[PDB]
Design a protein around this ligand. Structure first.
Ligand SMILES: Nc1ncnc2c1ncn2[C@@H]1O[C@H](COP(=O)(O)O)[C@@H](O)[C@H]1O
Ligand SMILES: Nc1ncnc2c1ncn2[C@@H]1O[C@H](COP(=O)(O)O)[C@@H](O)[C@H]1O
Ligand SMILES: [Cl-]
Ligand code: NA
Lengths: 58, 56, 58, 57, 60, 56
């Protein structure tokens, strides 16, 4: 388990999450754990596994 | 090692799998690497590595 | 809680293993380690890496 | 635990089903935590375990 | 480990590189940070967090 | 932990990547997660997770 990750400072930000299948989420980040990012996308709440993310634009 | 996935135990969720399948699931258990679910009359062990997103 | 997993509880059971490539194994589980599942499928003996498994129906 | 079922395969003839759909008719010559060393035909290969789906033995 | 284990990627911090992602994209990138799990880059006028698991190769 | 990959340093090898590309490579360094190579007139950092097999 890493002690430092840049993903932590994404909390509360509006970002673009590029998923490994080619979909993109216009997301607001509501939580970050070592392996998950929690987001709101429109009216949906999602848990996103980091392993399913390629890049995040912020 | 805090995880949000553990908060989902007992809840109805939609699990989006890496192959494109979507599970209309009730979460029955969560471990470090697995999520146990009921889907219809099926009982499944789902590996987290095979999950992309979960809608809850 | 260290090393707790549900997969080892499938030991000795008949299960359906859904592999990441879309193949499905009608399997009898004979052993479970941290990263591997040992199974019998018909007359074949297989080592299945957990990373290659999507779901197991039991 | 310091246990791997893959270690049972050392020195054995096996079929390795890779994630890309290829199958290796392999003789296992070594097993590390992350790799399986094999002879296939006249070739020596390092096979990463993460690229393996199943092994028939 | 507070002092990182050796990795070649940290030598690329501050450099211009081409990152080849698993999805077939190439990023013309300036590396601005490296963690255990991520590589931070500037691409055009975009700021990206790139997960190492999504990278195949880096040409430098 | 033991890595067979360390033994490949300085050798000419064929690296079969997960996307189907094949690198005709000279290995110039090996770390826990990376293999550094020369291919043509290019220098590449290759993540081990992107490699399927290496012929050597
Ligand atoms: N220590 C942990 N605690 C909780 N979940 C984990 C842990 N390690 C890995 N995971 C999850 O399991 C997936 C597969 O693990 P790995 O094969 O180690 O990458 C990860 O991408 C996470 O979603
Ligand atoms: N402690 C670490 N030091 C350097 N790179 C790492 C470390 N942990 C993970 N990585 C990289 O991040 C990738 C993530 O894969 P995984 O750990 O399997 O989710 C690995 O394949 C490595 O390239
Ligand atoms: Cl650095
Ligand atoms: Na650390």
């Amino acid at each position: 388990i890493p002690n430092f990750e840049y993903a932590r400072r994404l909390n509360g930000k509006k970002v673009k999450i590029f998923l490994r299948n080619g979909e993109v989420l216009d997301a607001e980040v509501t939580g970050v754990s070592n392996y998950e990012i929690m987001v709101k996308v429109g009216d949906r709440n999602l848990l996103v596994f980091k392993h399913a993310i390629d890049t995040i634009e912020y």
